[PDB]
Subunit: 160 residues, 4 copies
């Protein structure tokens, strides 16, 4: 059962178009028979992908700093306690990683995945980010224009 990780900025930092892409990304992850792994508290991109995944009957793993609540969009809550430190659990536990948008948090998570030699697809990050991460590891970086392209890169990659 493949595991696809979604990173992306939080609620305040995610633009409306990026939110829409994130939901659609989560749906398509679910319809291709994959598990979604993302951050279980963050309310921008990561939440939208989880809702997307859930709305289309997919399994979601949320990674979390118990404490209250959760979200009902999370199926398997994995609580680390690690506060501001590295749940590079995403990076390491995923088959493929997709970033929707960009910010300091997300840049950090993408660079760890590359360091760990795992492929990353970059959706809706700007040219600045696309060129830098490609400059880090051109064999591991895939830029996608929209969700369907991102999902195609994810399919091509899992065959390998």
């Amino acid at each position: 059962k493949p595991i696809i990780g979604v990173m992306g900025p939080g609620k305040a930092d995610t633009a409306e178009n990026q939110l829409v892409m994130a939901n659609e990304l989560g749906k398509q992850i679910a319809t291709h028979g994959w598990i979604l792994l993302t951050g279980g508290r963050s309310l921008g991109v990561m939440h939208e992908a989880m809702k997307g995944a859930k709305e289309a009957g997919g399994t979601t793993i949320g990674v979390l700093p118990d404490t209250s609540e959760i979200s009902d969009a999370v199926d398997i809550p994995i609580v680390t306690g690690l506060g501001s430190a590295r749940d590079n659990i995403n990076a390491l536990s995923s088959n493929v990683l997709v970033a929707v948008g960009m910010g300091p948090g997300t840049a950090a998570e993408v660079a760890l995945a590359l360091k760990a030699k795992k492929p990353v697809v970059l959706l809706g990050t700007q040219p600045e980010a696309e060129k830098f991460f490609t400059s880090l590891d051109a064999g591991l970086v895939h830029v996608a224009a929209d969700v369907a392209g991102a999902i195609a890169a994810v399919k091509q990659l899992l065959a390998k």
Copy 2:
């Protein structure tokens, strides 16, 4: 959402034979009761047995790692090694220690520190009575797999 039962225990070299038997059937019963099993993948004593108990009974297992192992449905790779995945303690609704050693002691203590109940099974007096001195209200001592599955059912309901 399914209850998640954390199991902790020593590895191959320090797990007596009766503890492996107890671990294997504890996992069977975790699954049989419709709970998710959470434990370490890759530890080849108590923890590896509970996962198989659980799989053999058609349960869902999560394995925390720092390949493995047919019996793990969801691998969570942490990347730490000689550190703390406190994932077991904080992710799981109830924790069952089967046997005892340094690793397991640290994890029982962290669970009590996060104020979760722990069921101690096949641990011995010194461990039972020390953990009880830490938080008596959170520490439950079971005699056999049955008394431990029992204590777990009686804890999810509260």
Copy 3:
């Protein structure tokens, strides 16, 4: 290289005043022996007193923290980690010898972790059940000290080997 001695204690209403006084004196004796004190870096309880005692004797101190902020004023070197309820095996792995003053859930995790790292732990001001329970984890690494002088003498011997 200067030896580093790790000190671990319980908290605050898990702390009695004999333990605060013993932690201060332990921390002085550590600094007087030319050793670095490594402990938790909050201005609270047993770890804080060890730190004030080391500073008072002209010792060097390292405080480990999670997060952000308010470092004890006795901390020379603050090590800020970003982990919350997550360990924080820094004390255990970085110290040559570790000393527990009192006992609580947190110190018990810390002590068990250090034994698993094959590091010697000196127990000071704990109850027979802790003493007995850790002794049963590893007889070879657990030193029960009766007072601060005994603690210091166990560290001394452990470093001389």
Copy 4:
């Protein structure tokens, strides 16, 4: 409290030789200013030269390692973490961070420092990096053209 300056760079042959000289001269100037050098505690790359540099000029050094561990001779205080993972320690413990060169590990440390809202001095990085990280946080990113520049950016940042 003596200030702590953290240095980050690449390891093996993500590392050009002039980077190795800049790192060593930088460590040397950090120690001459009465500052502590915090770095990765290994015997390789930018971080080791910076350490050797600091020592040679009478400075104190802190080396952060994973598990378990012994570690350069230039390290006074070893901080052994056992998080084989993320030492987020540099980012959060240093007053100022200086990156010498760039690679995946460095990229994550820098983004984490900017996520923690700490200023980063970028020495000997390519303009893709200078541009990307400036795109993340203009206010926190300082491109130095050389070791003297890098020090006068620290010195001033330590003064605000």
